[PDB]
Design a protein around this ligand. Structure first.
Ligand code: K0Y
Ligand code: CL
Ligand code: MG
Ligand code: MG
Ligand code: MG
Ligand code: MG
Lengths: 194, 194
């Protein structure tokens, strides 16, 4: 039934743009929408990756590695899966492992890689692959792991037990002013619901 | 350490604006960020997303999802029922309202998240994730009556909670839909809890 008729640019920045989107609704009537898109997407299967990093060590409970950063759009600190945009020509797996190492210092091993999934499809066209990665915390490579943040990147690492993730998140939100990411919360919820 | 210095409007639509955010990086250097906000927020958050757990005796527990044409995505997406919280509406009540409009189901609140961010590197958009149980054996949920508001066109897809990630992958493989990130994160955690 439904499909895009036209996409009129409204305002283009260096990083983001706003479009008036015109589409066919499923009655046969023309309608419009305001859409956001990034300016950076090239041939990549998605804008970005987020990494679900399962830190595994012998005689430790598995931990989920998370990162805390200032997020200008939010006016505040956010707790999120390690994540970044996919470079031109880069595979999602490579981007995941690169971003993981840059933001946390850990070197991971790929476990699985999602199809491109939508970040906020009522608002934007942005997509990521969600890449599950196991981190062998017994390997010396991951012993005293040093984040190699990029220019103007400043990230703290927070590793939380998978078996208590949601309470550990609720506890952190109760103790400082910060926002947990919706994907992080959803994953912690399902850990509880299973 | 980091904080917002100022916000310059770049472009304001009916529904969404684009701002240039000037912020202080932790080294003492001033830096800029392109940020998207909705124009609709008062509110604890912009919206709600409902995790609807359909419980029928002698049946697998299902998670109820909606498929909708998403203009920014230029395609159909599979998502948790969701909408914006009406000014003067609680997140809980928004959840039940939305769940009923989108799916026809009448649920009960199990729990409700703090405001969580949707894509904090791009937008300030936030939601409450609201876990609802649906008594599928109740007479009110026998033939669930979905109420599409103006310009909403919503298919309901219920999937077994214990195979959710495999079932979502099937739909993407077979049907060229995009799965929402929050839905995929929850589906992953269901598999990862084992
Ligand atoms: C040299 O300038 C920068 O790298 C600042 N980055 C952004 O403004 C930005 C906005 C969005 C979306 O993603 N990155
Ligand atoms: Cl439940
Ligand atoms: Mg990042
Ligand atoms: Mg990075
Ligand atoms: Mg909706
Ligand atoms: Mg609705």
């Amino acid at each position: 039934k439904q499909y895009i008729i036209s996409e009129e640019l409204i305002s283009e920045g260096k990083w983001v743009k706003l479009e008036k989107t015109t589409y066919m609704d499923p009655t046969g009537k023309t309608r419009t929408w305001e859409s956001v898109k990034r300016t950076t997407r090239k041939e990549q299967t998605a804008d970005g990756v987020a990494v679900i990093p399962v830190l595994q060590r012998t005689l430790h409970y598995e931990c989920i590695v998370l990162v805390k950063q200032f997020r200008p759009p939010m006016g505040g600190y956010c707790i999120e899966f390690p994540a970044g945009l996919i470079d031109d020509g880069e595979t999602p797996e490579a981007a995941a492992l690169r971003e993981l190492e840059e933001e946390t210092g850990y070197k991971g091993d790929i476990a699985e890689c999602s199809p491109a999934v939508c970040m906020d499809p009522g608002l934007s066209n942005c997509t990521i692959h969600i890449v599950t990665v196991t981190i062998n915390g017994d390997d010396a490579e991951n012993a005293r792991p040093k984040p190699k943040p990029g220019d103007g990147e400043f990230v703290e690492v927070i590793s939380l037990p998978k078996n208590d993730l949601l309470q550990r998140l609720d506890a952190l939100v109760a103790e400082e002013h910060l926002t947990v990411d919706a994907r992080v919360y959803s994953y912690a919820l399902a850990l509880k619901h299973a």
